[PDB]
Chains A and B, each alone.
Chain A
Amino acid sequence: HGKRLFIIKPSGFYDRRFLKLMRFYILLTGIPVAIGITLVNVFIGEAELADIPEGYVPEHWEYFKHPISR
Protein backbone atom coordinates (compact mmCIF):
# COMPACT_ATOMS: atom_id res chain seq x y z
CA HIS A 1 0.00 0.00 0.00
CA GLY A 2 1.11 3.56 -0.75
CA LYS A 3 -0.36 4.88 2.50
CA ARG A 4 2.97 6.14 3.88
CA LEU A 5 2.17 9.12 6.09
CA PHE A 6 4.36 11.85 7.54
CA ILE A 7 5.15 11.32 11.22
CA ILE A 8 5.08 14.59 13.14
CA LYS A 9 7.81 14.51 15.78
CA PRO A 10 10.35 16.84 17.40
CA SER A 11 13.78 17.37 15.88
CA GLY A 12 16.21 14.63 16.84
CA PHE A 13 19.11 16.40 15.13
CA TYR A 14 20.36 18.24 18.21
CA ASP A 15 20.16 15.24 20.55
CA ARG A 16 22.02 13.04 18.06
CA ARG A 17 24.63 15.74 17.52
CA PHE A 18 25.24 16.12 21.26
CA LEU A 19 25.50 12.36 21.73
CA LYS A 20 27.97 12.00 18.85
CA LEU A 21 30.08 14.91 20.13
CA MET A 22 30.19 13.55 23.68
CA ARG A 23 31.09 10.06 22.47
CA PHE A 24 33.75 11.49 20.16
CA TYR A 25 35.56 13.45 22.86
CA ILE A 26 35.27 10.75 25.53
CA LEU A 27 36.69 8.21 23.07
CA LEU A 28 39.29 10.71 21.81
CA THR A 29 40.96 10.53 25.17
CA GLY A 30 39.82 7.09 26.37
CA ILE A 31 41.01 4.93 23.47
CA PRO A 32 44.67 6.06 23.80
CA VAL A 33 44.40 5.68 27.59
CA ALA A 34 43.02 2.14 27.27
CA ILE A 35 45.70 1.20 24.72
CA GLY A 36 48.47 2.62 26.90
CA ILE A 37 47.19 0.86 30.01
CA THR A 38 47.01 -2.45 28.13
CA LEU A 39 50.54 -2.03 26.75
CA VAL A 40 51.94 -1.13 30.18
CA ASN A 41 50.19 -4.11 31.77
CA VAL A 42 51.38 -6.55 29.10
CA PHE A 43 54.97 -5.43 28.59
CA ILE A 44 56.03 -3.75 31.85
CA GLY A 45 53.71 -4.29 34.76
CA GLU A 46 53.39 -6.63 37.74
CA ALA A 47 56.34 -5.99 40.00
CA GLU A 48 56.96 -8.72 42.56
CA LEU A 49 57.50 -8.40 46.30
CA ALA A 50 61.06 -8.83 47.56
CA ASP A 51 63.03 -8.54 50.80
CA ILE A 52 64.94 -5.30 51.36
CA PRO A 53 68.68 -5.98 50.94
CA GLU A 54 70.79 -5.20 53.99
CA GLY A 55 72.11 -1.64 54.00
CA TYR A 56 69.86 -0.55 51.11
CA VAL A 57 67.13 2.05 51.66
CA PRO A 58 64.46 2.06 48.92
CA GLU A 59 62.86 5.05 47.25
CA HIS A 60 59.41 6.11 48.43
CA TRP A 61 57.90 4.93 45.13
CA GLU A 62 59.58 1.52 45.46
CA TYR A 63 56.96 0.43 48.01
CA PHE A 64 54.23 0.25 45.35
CA LYS A 65 53.32 -2.53 42.93
CA HIS A 66 51.67 -1.13 39.79
CA PRO A 67 54.02 0.71 37.38
CA ILE A 68 51.50 3.51 36.81
CA SER A 69 51.09 3.96 40.57
CA ARG A 70 54.87 3.96 41.02
Chain B
Amino acid sequence: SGYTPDEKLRLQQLRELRRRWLKDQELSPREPVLPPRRVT
Protein backbone atom coordinates (compact mmCIF):
# COMPACT_ATOMS: atom_id res chain seq x y z
CA SER B 1 0.00 0.00 0.00
CA GLY B 2 0.98 3.63 0.46
CA TYR B 3 1.33 6.58 -1.86
CA THR B 4 2.50 6.09 -5.41
CA PRO B 5 5.43 8.35 -6.34
CA ASP B 6 3.17 10.54 -8.48
CA GLU B 7 0.75 10.89 -5.56
CA LYS B 8 3.61 11.81 -3.23
CA LEU B 9 4.95 14.45 -5.60
CA ARG B 10 1.54 15.98 -6.32
CA LEU B 11 0.74 16.09 -2.60
CA GLN B 12 4.08 17.80 -1.91
CA GLN B 13 3.48 20.47 -4.56
CA LEU B 14 -0.11 21.07 -3.46
CA ARG B 15 1.07 21.26 0.15
CA GLU B 16 3.66 23.95 -0.54
CA LEU B 17 1.14 25.94 -2.61
CA ARG B 18 -1.47 25.67 0.17
CA ARG B 19 1.00 26.74 2.84
CA ARG B 20 1.95 29.76 0.73
CA TRP B 21 -1.73 30.69 0.37
CA LEU B 22 -2.37 30.27 4.10
CA LYS B 23 0.66 32.41 4.98
CA ASP B 24 -0.58 35.04 2.53
CA GLN B 25 -3.89 35.14 4.41
CA GLU B 26 -2.18 36.98 7.30
CA LEU B 27 -2.74 40.69 7.88
CA SER B 28 -0.01 43.32 7.93
CA PRO B 29 0.22 45.66 10.95
CA ARG B 30 -1.56 48.47 9.06
CA GLU B 31 -4.05 46.23 7.25
CA PRO B 32 -7.37 47.53 8.65
CA VAL B 33 -6.82 51.01 7.20
CA LEU B 34 -9.73 52.85 8.81
CA PRO B 35 -10.88 56.18 7.31
CA PRO B 36 -11.98 58.55 10.10
CA ARG B 37 -14.60 61.27 9.76
CA ARG B 38 -17.09 62.86 12.16
CA VAL B 39 -19.90 65.39 11.69
CA THR B 40 -21.54 54.95 38.79
Q: Which residues of A contact B (CB under 8 A)?
A: 3-6
Contacts and interface: CB of A to CB of B under 8 A. Distances in A.
A7 B27 CA distance: 10
Contacts, number: 11
Contacts of B25: 5-6
Contacts of B16: none
Interface string B24-39: 0111000100000000
Contacts of B26: 3-6
Interface string B1-40: 0000000000000000000000001110001000000000
A3 B25 CA distance: 10
Nearest to B32: A4
